[PDB]
Amino acid sequence: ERPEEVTEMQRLVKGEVVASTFDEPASRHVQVAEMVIEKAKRLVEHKKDVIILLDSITRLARAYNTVVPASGKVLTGGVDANALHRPKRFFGAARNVEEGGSLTIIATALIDTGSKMDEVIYEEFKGTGNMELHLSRKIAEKRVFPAIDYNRSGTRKEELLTTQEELQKMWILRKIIHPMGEIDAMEFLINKLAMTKTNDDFFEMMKRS
Amino acid sequence: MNLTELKNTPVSELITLGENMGLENLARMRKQDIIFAILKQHAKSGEDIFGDGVLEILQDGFGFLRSADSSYLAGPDDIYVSPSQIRRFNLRTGDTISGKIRPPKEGERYFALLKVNEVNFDKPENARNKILFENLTPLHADLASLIGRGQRGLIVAPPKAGKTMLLQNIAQSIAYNHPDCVLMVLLIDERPEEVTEMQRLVKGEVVASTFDEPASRHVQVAEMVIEKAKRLVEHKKDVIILLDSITRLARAYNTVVPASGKVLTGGVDANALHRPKRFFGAARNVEEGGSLTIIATALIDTGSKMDEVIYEEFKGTGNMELHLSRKIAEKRVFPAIDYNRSGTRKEELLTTQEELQKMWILRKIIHPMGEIDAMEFLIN
Amino acid sequence: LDLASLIGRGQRGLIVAPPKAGKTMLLQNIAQSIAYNHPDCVLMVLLIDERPEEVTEMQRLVKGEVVASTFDEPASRHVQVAEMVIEKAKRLVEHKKDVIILLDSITRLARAYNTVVPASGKVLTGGVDANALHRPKRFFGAARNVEEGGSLTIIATALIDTGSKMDEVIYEEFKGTGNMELHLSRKIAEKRVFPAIDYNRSGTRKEELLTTQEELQKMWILRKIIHPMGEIDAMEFLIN
Amino acid sequence: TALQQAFDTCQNNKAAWLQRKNELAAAEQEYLRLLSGEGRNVSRLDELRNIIEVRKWQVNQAAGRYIRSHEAVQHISIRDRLNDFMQQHGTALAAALAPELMGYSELTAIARNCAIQRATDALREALLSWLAKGEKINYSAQDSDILTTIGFRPDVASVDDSREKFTPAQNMIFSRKSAQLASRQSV
Ligand SMILES: Nc1ncnc2c1ncn2[C@@H]1O[C@H](COP(=O)(O)OP(=O)(O)OP(O)(O)=S)[C@@H](O)[C@H]1O
Ligand SMILES: [Mg+2]
Incomplete structure (x- = not known):
């Protein structure tokens, strides 16, 4: 990530933030990722709720690709077969442990960048x-x-993450939104939430109308 | 000792057994390495030891025993098998050994099998005269409605189409409708939470591999599970395989198999295409007793064209x-x-009565679902 | 081949074909299949407004009586032979005996009713009178099974895509x-x-967000069931 | 002798429903207390709402089970009192209702149920005419205590809390949530 973005992150987060700029090589990127994932695992082993915001998984995958030794099996766009094994593990560590604590990972991905590597990584x-x-x-x-x-967005198995009534309230909202165009749906939603004060207020306002 | 209960039990009390036995460095490595510490400590001690697992051969000569509860991964929990034992009991990959083993010594770092009590719930010498699958010609000599006995089934679906719950309901129906039949569920590169809920929801044993661990891991677990199915159908017990998904397994074999020099559409080679037919052919039919019925799942419109290629x-x-x-x-x-062809060829106009080799019996038939349509190709 | 295999006993059914598709000899084969497999059932071959030579061929290549109307006379003959055959079928129902009817064709009968029915002001797109609709509905629903004894059943023949516009409305x-x-x-x-x-309708809403089992109700099953021809697949539209 | 076991089942179902009501009320008041507080424990509020929903479903299930047990107790008590009244006055009832009764002994099922419905209609007007005086109806000899403890009708709370119904999807999801909560409580 660019240094100005790095310092803006430094100054706009309460929790600790770690970054490696594009100036530094890919070995730096992979070792930073390993440090972060190991620290998160150690913390969650103590029944702690750890949250990791990653920007971006595409660049991490590219760094892993350009640092891993070749295996002779290259996919389209120049992506090695076993190169993506390491990032997946990093992105597969997210889980909800029954013993105690949890590890949440929100990793962003890049699309429509004009690159076959990014498209392959997304796929x-x-x-x-x-x-x-x-x-x-x-x-x-x-x-x-x-x-x-x-x-086009959504969450799977959201039932365990919410109560009953607001679930079908959101289902009604989705049924309303779906026929509308995505830009029209977004502007409609923004306008509707603008005149409200709370998500519950918006829910009651839409169900009374 | 009883490796089945020693390994199946959770670490919560296995750790207490560990400090009670006399070990000090535990709860520090993986769940199999602590079993290796138990191995070493009991090798220092002395007592007759059982050893169980699914036997597999390695190319250079010595074999291992995969564990069902270990999700079929290689590690310190392996049983050494000498080539002499392999050749004297003509051992092949997939046999469920539950025999007497020996402690490790100088040269062998883990358990070594010395003799087998029973080969897959059958006597060793008794099973020495069983017919292989290949030379046994395939002939027939709610699971019943959907696939019946001996047939091969596949379910093609898109994402977010109730695949996991469909597999769940099929599993419970197999459990209570067919308690005698052996349930077996195989998952490929699925999410860990899905694997956990499959293991904790169904009655039958589940072997699953997550997407984190590599493609060759999926390769070996698929090989082990198919060999286990073949060696459980040999002694006349019926087994059902719940495969999810064939598309990701094909992807794994495509990305692991060495290139044959020619490439098809989707970046696939002939080896990765003629492998999956082995799973189906092994489950094509069973003749005199038991069965091997596979129900696989396939993904469609996932955004990548190679999966529609493999589907087609x-x-x-x-x-x-x-x-x-x-x-x-x-x-x-x-x-x-x-x-x-026909649109430009006008029904091919090859004969005035060529239309009587293409009929469609289109009856409305009754089922527990209730008055469901039906169709037939009378393609003579 | 056997009617019990295809049409069973007591339930109605249709076969629909385009021009130049093999109707006459298929009806012939059905006729002798009925004659040999179930000689007990009373054969009844019926033709409406087609070439006289085929009428003679039908009535000469089968054993049952073939009341038929060639294409020379007007449609009043066709309509009145329709009522008299349905009345004799009802009488045979009162006679406690099974009957099989091979009518050809119901599109011919329907548009004959259309061109003969008096005007009532209930015409629709294409000038199709409502009376010329539910009179054929009465005739077609008179083919219900006999629940007290025996079983009447009919096999229907319809023509499609004949270069006209009247036929597809009655077809749908x-x-x-x-x-x-x-x-x-x-x-x-x-x-x-x-x-x-x-x-x-579905695509107008694209992938409709059908909640819970509403999405899973739509199911398609292809079973390669065993058939005397050998592994004839059967495809079923499973709904809830 | 199954009436005593049915009474015990009704009693323990009532106790289960009452205790369900107690922890539901406790969770409700604790959630209101936390809302009155100024803390930013939003996740605590969300899990409290989840607890409220799960406990409401549990209360509804317990109330339904208690209602079913109450109906079973009433039915079995009515049947037993019917049996030991008919073993006394069967000859008299037969003499007063004879025609259809020896019609039953040799007539076909159509005539059988026609006579059955005629007799039940006749006794329907008989009861509606007899209830004109409407004296204080007392319970039976040995089942009076059971019918008094069970009561004429269940509690109003146990019937109004069951107005809402859940389709099998909601039943399955709330069963899963209740099992998860039981696992949470066990740990
Ligand atoms: N009969 C049903 N009962 C209850 N929920 C149902 C039913 N049918 C569909 N659903 C809902 O369908 C949703 C999606 O089902 P899933 O099985 O998760 O889809 P999916 O086919 O598994 O796609 P994946 O595996 O997540 S990529 C679930 O959240 C269920 O609540
Ligand atoms: Mg699923």
């Missing part, structure tokens, strides 16, 4: 995570933010 | 095809290539 | 009311088994 990581969120450039072209594709 | 290559292999999307159902049921 | 309303409908041509098979109207 190999597409069906892995259990929570997922798309953003789109064309929604941000209207400068309405956040540029979130509501219809 | 797997269109005709199975006999029962459970579809959850209309887009591929219409293609598989009604191929368009013949239509591409 | 038969589709709405059809019990079983054998098909020969290509496109109409997919039209029925995978309704394009339903597909467009």
Whole structure:
């Protein structure tokens, strides 16, 4: 990540933040990732809730690809077969331990970058995570933010993460949003939440209407 | 000792057994390495030791014993088997050994099998005269409705289409409707939470590999599970394989198999294409006793074209095809290539009565579902 | 071949074919299959408004009586022979005896009713009178099974894509009311088994967010069931 | 002699429903107390709402089971009192209702159930005419204590808390959540 972004992260987070710039080699990236994942595992071993925000898994996968020794089995775009094994483990460490504590990983991915490497990395990581969120450039072209594709996003097995009534409240919201266009849906949602004060207030406002 | 209960038990009391036995460096390595510490300490001690596992041969001569509860991974919990024992009991990969083993010594760092009490719940010399699968010609000499006995089934579905719950319900139906039959569930590169819920929800044993551990791991676990199925069907017990998914297993073999010099569409080679037919052929039919019935799952419209390529290559292999999307159902049921010819060829006009080799018996048939449609190709 | 294998006993059914598709000899084969397999059932071959030579061939190559109307006379003959055959069928029902009817064709009878029925002001797209609809509905629903003794059953014949517009409307309303409908041509098979109207309705909302089992209800099963021809697949549309 | 076991089952189901009500009330008041507080324990509030939902489902299930047990106790007591009343006055009832009764002995099932429904209708007008005086109806000899402890009708709370119904999907999800909560409590 660029140094100015690194220092902005430094100054805009309460928790500790670690970054390796593009100036430093890929071995630096992989060792930083190993340090972070090992520290997270050690902390969660003590029944601690650890959260890791990763930006980005694509660059980490590229660094692992360009640091791992070759194996003779290269995919399209120049991605080695066993190169992606290490990042997946890093992204597979996220779990909810029954003994105590949890390890949550929110890792962002890059798409439509004009690269075959990034596309291959996305395809190999597409069906892995259990929570997922798309953003789109064309929604941000209207400068309405956040540029979130509501219809195409979602979470799996959300039932265990919420109570009953608000679940079908959100289902009704999804049924309302789905026919609308994604830009239209986003602007509608922004306008509706603008005049409310709380998600519960928005829920009651939409169900009374 | 009783390795089954020693390994199956959780670490919560295995650790207490560890400090009670006389060990000091425990709760520090993986769950198999602490068993290796138990191995070394009891080798220092002395008492007759049982050894169980699924035997597998390695290319240079010595064999190992995979553990079902270990998700079929190689490690310190391996049973050394000498080539003499392999040749005297013509041992092949997949046998469930539950025999008498010996402590390690100078040269061998782990347990070594000395004799077998019973070969897969059968006497060793008694099973020495069993017919192999290949020379036994395939002939027939709710699981029952969907696939029955001896047939091969596959379920093609998109993501977020209830695949995991469908497999769950199939598993429970197998459990209570067919208690006598042996349940076996295999998962490929699935999420750890899904693996845990499969293991803790179904009655039968589950062998699963997560996406973190590499593709060759999936290769070896698939080989071990198919060999185990073959060696449980040899002594006339029926087994059902719950494979999820064939697409990811094909991906793993494609990304691990050495290139043959020629490439098909999707970056696949002939070896990775003719491997998966071995699993189906081993489950094609069983003759006199038991069965080997495989129900696999396949992924569609996942965003990458190679998985539709492998699906189209797997269109005709199975006999029962459970579809959850209309887009591929219409293609598989009604191929368009013949239509591409016919549209320009005008039903091929080869004979005035050539239309009586293409009928469709289109009855509405009754089932517990209730008055369901039916179709038939009378393609003479 | 056997009617019990295809049409069973007591339930109605249709077969629909395009022009130049092999109707006459298929009806012949069905006729002798009925004659040999079930000689007890009373054979009844019926023809409406077609060439006299084929009428003679039908009535000469079978054993049962063949009341038929060639294509010379007007449609009043066709309609009145329709009522008299249905009345004799009802009498045979009162006679405590099973009957099989091979009618050809119901599209011919339907549009004969259309061109003969008096005007009532209930016409629709294409000038199709409502009376010329539910009179054929009465005739087609008179083919119900006899629950007290014996079983009447009929096999229907319909023509499709004849270069006209009257036939497909009655075809789609038969589709709405059809019990079983054998098909020969290509496109109409997919039209029925995978309704394009339903597909467009679904696609208007794209992948509709059907909650819980509503998404899993739509199921498709292909079982390669054992058949005397050898491994004839059967495809079933499982719904909830 | 199954009536005593049925009474014991009704009693323990009532106790289970009452205790369910108690921890539901305790969780509710604790959640309101935490809401009154100024702490930022949002996750605590979310899991408290989950607890409220799970306990409400458990209370509904316990109330339904108690209602079923109450109905079973009433049915078995009515059946037993019916039997030891009919073993006394069967000849008199037969003499007063004879025609259809020896019609039953040799007529076909259609005539059998026609006579059955005629007799039940006749006794229906008989009861509705007899209840005109409406004197204080007393319980039986030995089942009076059981019927008094069980009561004429269940509690109003145990019936109004069961107005809401759950489809099998909700039943499955709440059973899974209750099992998870039981595992949490065990640890
Ligand atoms: N009969 C049903 N009963 C209850 N929930 C159902 C039923 N049918 C569908 N669902 C819901 O369907 C949702 C998605 O089902 P899943 O089985 O998770 O989909 P999926 O096919 O497994 O796709 P994956 O495995 O997550 S990629 C679940 O959250 C269920 O709540
Ligand atoms: Mg699933």
